[PDB]
Amino acid sequence: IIRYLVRETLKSQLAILFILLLIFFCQKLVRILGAAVDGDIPANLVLSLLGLGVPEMAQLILPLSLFLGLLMTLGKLYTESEITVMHACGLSKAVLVKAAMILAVFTAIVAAVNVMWAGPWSSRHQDEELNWRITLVFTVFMMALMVVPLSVVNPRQGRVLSMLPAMLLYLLFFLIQTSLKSNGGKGKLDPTLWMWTVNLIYLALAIVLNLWD
Amino acid sequence: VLDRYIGKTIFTTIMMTLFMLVSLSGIIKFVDQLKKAGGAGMYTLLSVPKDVQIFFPMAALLGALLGLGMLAQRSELVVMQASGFTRMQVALSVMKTAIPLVLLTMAIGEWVAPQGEQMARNYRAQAMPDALSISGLHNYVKYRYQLNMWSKIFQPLSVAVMMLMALSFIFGPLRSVPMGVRVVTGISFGFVFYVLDQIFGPLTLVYGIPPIIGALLPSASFFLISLW
Amino acid sequence: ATLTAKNLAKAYKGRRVVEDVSLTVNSGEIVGLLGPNGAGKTTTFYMVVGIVPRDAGNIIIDDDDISLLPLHARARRGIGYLPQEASIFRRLSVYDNLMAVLQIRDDLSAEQREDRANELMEEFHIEHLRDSMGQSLSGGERRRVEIARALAANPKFILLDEPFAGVDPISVIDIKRIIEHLRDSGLGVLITDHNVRETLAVCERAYIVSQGHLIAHGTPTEILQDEHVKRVYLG
Amino acid sequence: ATLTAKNLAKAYKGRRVVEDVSLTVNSGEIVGLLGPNGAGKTTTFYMVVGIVPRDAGNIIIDDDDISLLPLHARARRGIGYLPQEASIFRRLSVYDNLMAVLQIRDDLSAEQREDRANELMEEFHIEHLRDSMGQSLSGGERRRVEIARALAANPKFILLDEPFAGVDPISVIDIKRIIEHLRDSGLGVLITDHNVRETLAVCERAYIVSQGHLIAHGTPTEILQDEHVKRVYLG
């Protein structure tokens, strides 16, 4: 079986996830992690620093990890021209989007736990609307459908510039998606329910590019 | 000229990696600032050039290594070595196109990035220091961080050493055509220089030192460590 | 069965490379597509299999015009393709590649899949490299397992580009015997090569292309008799 | 000048591939290194140029043992290498590649640089593709500009691996004339190929390798007379 797609791209998944979690904590893992060797040693200094910033950067970078690691090595596969014979053995785009949704649901469980079981930890160790938990497990569920035809690199006109139309579309997503949730308020407070629609309107231009008829 | 070619590919990937970091961290700040405080359209360029000054050399590391590895996998570096390039392509190419990209970040942090946060400070008035020059430091001496900002000013060469022995690990790899399995180890084994260099700083004071050579030793020892 | 193209054309940035290229292949036929450098062979193959957007032409299987239908449904209709540059999987092993391609074969169970894989590894003699990882092979075994994973799909028509690249002559004559035995099975093949003194021994008839101009076609004795192409391409 | 290796050895994961391989080349000599698939040619080339860490052997220029000195200082000592797989620059143009390699030549000014570049593009006949971008060429022009950027550095010794890959025979005989004219200039060359019926016409003597075992060496008539290698490699 050609399950190799998920087995290869999960390496890039974990690689880009760890290399982008140690960055954005560089100025903490330098400063306070170095000052703790001489100055002060409690347990909840390094544990406090580990608890600093981990849930929102988890829930934000792990979708980025998916649509950037699925861009990188699968574009290497395109530019080493391997899909042009894999494609040429009775397959279609269906097998790539099936592999993409399989790796996306494999990361859906960690994308689920780093909100659902990191919430009360965030309360207790950070004090020191429920549609959002469907939109967040949906926004990893859509990038696997979105980037698979978007970086479809030709063997003769190839480049790394293809990451820009996959990152700015996520940015025009995520400037709006969290700003419409700061409208309204907390919990049972009610802003406009157009966040029920922006996910669907992104599913629309996902699925047309995946169709291409 | 291979100088302007390798500068072309590293510059075109380095804009990508810098955008990918700073436009991410901008929305990192945007989501919790509009969570707690707040209103519509200033928060993006609220904090851009100081984020450039922070995230520039790490993006330099990541992009230079990743683009040079993507070029390197298709045997271009081994055939340019076969024609007669050496460490000289590193020295007068990747340095020669990367440290002029850190001179203007020093320019942004000397010229306008303190004003880049002054604009944020005096636009805080609708709601409810590690960035300076010598003009406070020599009176702070009479008033520690006695040469810590002096070391902060001195970083075209720390980024050079940061990047240099890092991409020395990608100058080599030749087991078959090793396919980027170790560029992650290259950025890993080169990442710990911020863990060591900035924290060797507090180690200097404890037994009596001139902080000039106290800052110039850990930066230049790793310059000397891997001259292959 | 019969695949036929009629007056193909392809260009980019004004510099045209293909004009009025036509070709005809039946089921059970060995046709060749020799030509000098930059003649248009791989672009013709691109227009046949549906890699590039064609500017003119008619790809038809004599009754169904699939000329605006993309490659994956073309391969489901039954053409076979091999890339010019090397395109093996770059972490698998050899048996992993072959059995993974044979999973798509919807005609036989997995014990016959591993049976056919053992037959192919025995028949190309790669059993003493059958468990090496993919990306670190040498060029001879890499092109040999390219031809293996191409032939494993069993199409009606099959297209090759330089199948003899970096191959020692004993394995060349081996692959010659394999393709002519599949011609005895009755499966049409189209070949582009540069080793002419081993390519002409197997091919039945041979289209000759020079910068879009299909300047010759016929038997090996006539295309060797042609003083035009002896000036243009042979020397 | 003279390059000589003595009893090379290389292995990985227990499976040894090179045992006691030795070779000898002088200045102004055309030696060949034919062999079947997986014989050890490119690994021998790796141990000569210093790509892989050698397990045993002596790379020496008859007076200076450079066998533990890496590749860039080896090329500054004056060996020449060409990769087996294609390794052109993948955004430049052809003249850009040639003049960029000729910038390293520290013996002549830039007007003689562009003069030599014009001579090489005229002498390989690539002037009608001289401004195409690099990565989108065809295989014939790609290998031709590989040989061009290899020959442009002017070393004392030069190593090739499959210089005839995907090349039409007129350009093959052209490159044959170029290398034998540089033999008239007196520069030693080492060649690995598979088109034997065009490789033997140019080579002076030919080492033959089979799985580490240097089983034969001599004149073309003797290595064609050998019924061992006719069984092993020719057929």
The residues spanned by each domain of chain C are 1-230
Distance of alpha carbon C205 from alpha carbon C191, whole angstroms: 11
Residue linked to tokens 């980025």: A64
Distance of alpha carbon A114 from alpha carbon A137, whole angstroms: 11
Spell out which residues of chain C touch residue A4, defining contact as CB-CB under 8 Å. 89, 91-92, 100
SS3 sequence of D100-127: HHHCCCCCCCHHHHHHHHHHHHHHHCCH
Distance of alpha carbon A151 from alpha carbon A162, whole angstroms: 6
C39 assigned ligand-binding residue: yes
Do C41 and C209 meet the contact criterion of CB atoms below 8 Å apart?
yes
Backbone angles phi, psi at D16, to 5 degrees: -75, 145
Angle between helices B211-225 and B157-171 (to 10 degrees): 10
- C101 closest CA partner among C90, C116, C91, C79: C116
| D11 DSSP β-pair partners | D16
C40 assigned ligand-binding residue: yes
| Cβ neighbourhood burial of C17 (10 Å; 0-12, 13-18, 19+) | middle
Do B115 and B176 meet the contact criterion of CB atoms below 8 Å apart?
no
Q: Work out whether strand D213-218 and strand D205-210 pair parallel, antiparallel, or are unpaired.
A: antiparallel
Tell me how far apart the terminal alpha carbons of chain B are, to the nearest angstrom. Answer: 23
* Count of C-beta atoms within a 10 Å radius of residue B139: 9
Torsion over CA: D173, D176, D178, D181 (sign): negative
Check CB contact of A89 with chain C, cutoff 8 Å: yes
**Distance, in angstroms, between B193 CA and closest chain D CA?**
27
- A89 closest CA partner among C103, C51, C126, C93: C103
Distance of alpha carbon D70 from alpha carbon C4, whole angstroms: 55
Of residues D85, D140, D233, nearest to C170 (C-beta): D233
Q: Which of A89, A91, A154 to mutate to test the interface with C (most CBs of C within 10 A)?
A: A89
Do C137 and C86 meet the contact criterion of CB atoms below 8 Å apart?
no
Do D195 and D164 meet the contact criterion of CB atoms below 8 Å apart?
yes
Contacts 24+ apart (CB under 8 A), C164-167: C164/C193, C164/C194, C164/C195, C164/C198, C164/C199, C165/C139, C165/D165, C165/D166, C166/C139, C166/C140, C166/C142, C166/D84, C166/D162, C166/D165, C166/D194, C167/C140, C167/C143, C167/D37, C167/D194
C24 assigned ligand-binding residue: no
Cα A186 to chain center, whole Å? 25
| D206 DSSP β-pair partners | D32, D218
Residues 6+ apart with CB under 8 A from B133: B110, B153
| Cβ neighbourhood burial of D152 (10 Å; 0-12, 13-18, 19+) | buried
Of residues B9, B81, B177, nearest to D72 (C-beta): B81
Measure the CA dihedral A12/B93/D73/B183, to 10°: -10
Contact D196 C233 (CB under 8 A): no
Contact C72 A81 (CB under 8 A): no
- A111 closest CA partner among A146, A144, A137, A138: A137
Distance of alpha carbon A171 from alpha carbon B27, whole angstroms: 9
Check CB contact of C52 with chain A, cutoff 8 Å: no
Contact D84 C234 (CB under 8 A): no
Quote the Cα angle for B124-B128-B132, to 5°.
Answer: 35
Q: Which of D10, D13, D54, D72 to mutate to test the interface with B (most CBs of B within 10 A)?
A: D72
C35 assigned ligand-binding residue: yes
- D67 closest CA partner among D79, D57, D76: D57
Spell out which residues of chain C touch residue A92, defining contact as CB-CB under 8 Å. 72-73, 76
C-alpha distances out from residue B50 to A197, B33, B59, C160, D108, Å: 36, 17, 14, 56, 48
Do B97 and B11 meet the contact criterion of CB atoms below 8 Å apart?
yes
| C217 DSSP β-pair partners | C207
Helix (H) or strand (E) holding D197: helix D196-199
Distance of alpha carbon D68 from alpha carbon D51, whole angstroms: 11
* Count of C-beta atoms within a 10 Å radius of residue A44: 11
Measure the CA dihedral B114/B116/B122/B126, to 10°: -140
Check CB contact of B32 with chain A, cutoff 8 Å: yes
Of residues D86, D169, D194, nearest to C168 (C-beta): D194
Distance of alpha carbon B112 from alpha carbon C17, whole angstroms: 54
| DSSP 8-state class, residue C128 | G
Do D96 and D131 meet the contact criterion of CB atoms below 8 Å apart?
no
Distance of alpha carbon A30 from alpha carbon B201, whole angstroms: 12
Q: Work out whether strand D188-191 and strand D205-210 pair parallel, antiparallel, or are unpaired.
A: unpaired
Distance of alpha carbon A186 from alpha carbon A175, whole angstroms: 19
Tokens in use for B56? 């520039």
Quote the Cα angle for C38-C43-C44, to 5°.
Answer: 110
Do D194 and C166 meet the contact criterion of CB atoms below 8 Å apart?
yes
Tokens in use for C65? 């015009």
C-alpha distances out from residue C199 to B97, C32, C110, C165, C205, Å: 50, 8, 36, 12, 11
C-alpha distances out from residue C143 to B117, C147, C153, C167, Å: 60, 6, 16, 8
**Distance, in angstroms, between B175 CA and closest chain D CA?**
6
- A71 closest CA partner among A165, A141, A157, A4: A165
Do C95 and C130 meet the contact criterion of CB atoms below 8 Å apart?
yes
**Distance, in angstroms, between D95 CA and closest chain A CA?**
19
Spell out which residues of chain A touch residue B54, defining contact as CB-CB under 8 Å. 27
Distance of alpha carbon D47 from alpha carbon D8, whole angstroms: 8
C42 assigned ligand-binding residue: yes
Q: Work out whether strand C213-218 and strand C205-210 pair parallel, antiparallel, or are unpaired.
A: antiparallel
Every domain of chain A and the residues it spans: 4-211
Distance of alpha carbon C7 from alpha carbon A125, whole angstroms: 72
Spell out which residues of chain C touch residue A88, defining contact as CB-CB under 8 Å. 49, 71-72, 75, 80-81
Contact C166 D170 (CB under 8 A): no
| C3 DSSP β-pair partners | C25
Tokens in use for D27? 């200045």
Backbone angles phi, psi at A30, to 5 degrees: -85, -65
Do A103 and A14 meet the contact criterion of CB atoms below 8 Å apart?
no
Residues 6+ apart with CB under 8 A from C41: C33, C35, C161, C192, C209
| Cβ neighbourhood burial of D1 (10 Å; 0-12, 13-18, 19+) | middle
Tell me how far apart the terminal alpha carbons of chain D are, to the nearest angstrom. Answer: 37
Tokens in use for D156? 């004392």
Backbone angles phi, psi at D21, to 5 degrees: -75, 125
Check CB contact of D147 with chain B, cutoff 8 Å: no
**Rg of the Cα atoms in chain D:** 18
Spell out which residues of chain A touch residue B21, defining contact as CB-CB under 8 Å. 23-24
C-alpha distances out from residue B79 to A94, B5, D12, D103, D150, Å: 40, 15, 24, 15, 9
* Count of C-beta atoms within a 10 Å radius of residue D87: 19
Contact C51 A84 (CB under 8 A): yes
Tokens in use for C76? 């489901």
Cα D105 to chain center, whole Å? 20
Backbone angles phi, psi at C77, to 5 degrees: -75, -20
Distance of alpha carbon C182 from alpha carbon B170, whole angstroms: 47
| Cβ neighbourhood burial of A105 (10 Å; 0-12, 13-18, 19+) | middle
No. of H helices and E strands in chain A? Answer: 11, 0
Measure the CA dihedral B35/B38/B40/B46, to 10°: -90
Q: Which of D85, D133, D135 to mutate to test the interface with A (most CBs of A within 10 A)?
A: D135
Do D126 and D145 meet the contact criterion of CB atoms below 8 Å apart?
yes
Distance of alpha carbon D9 from alpha carbon D54, whole angstroms: 7
Residue linked to tokens 């080599």: B172
Do A206 and A142 meet the contact criterion of CB atoms below 8 Å apart?
yes
| D21 DSSP β-pair partners | D8
Do D164 and D198 meet the contact criterion of CB atoms below 8 Å apart?
yes
Listed resolution, Å: 4.3
The residue of chain C with its CA nearest to that of D139 is C37
- For D60: left if phi > 0, alpha if psi spans -120 to 50, otherwise beta; the answer is beta
b/e code C165-200 from CB counts within 10 Å (16+ = b): bbbbbbbbebbbebbeebbeeebbbbbbbbbbebbb
Residues 6+ apart with CB under 8 A from D46: B174, D10, D52
Cα C171 to chain center, whole Å? 17
Residue linked to tokens 């076609």: C217
Q: Which of B81, B86, B227 to mutate to test the interface with D (most CBs of D within 10 A)?
A: B81
Contact C170 D196 (CB under 8 A): no
Distance of alpha carbon B59 from alpha carbon B12, whole angstroms: 12
* Count of C-beta atoms within a 10 Å radius of residue D20: 13
D1-230 — its CATH code?
A: 3.40.50.300
Backbone angles phi, psi at B199, to 5 degrees: -95, -15
What letter represents residue A66's amino acid?
L
Residues 6+ apart with CB under 8 A from B154: B215, B219
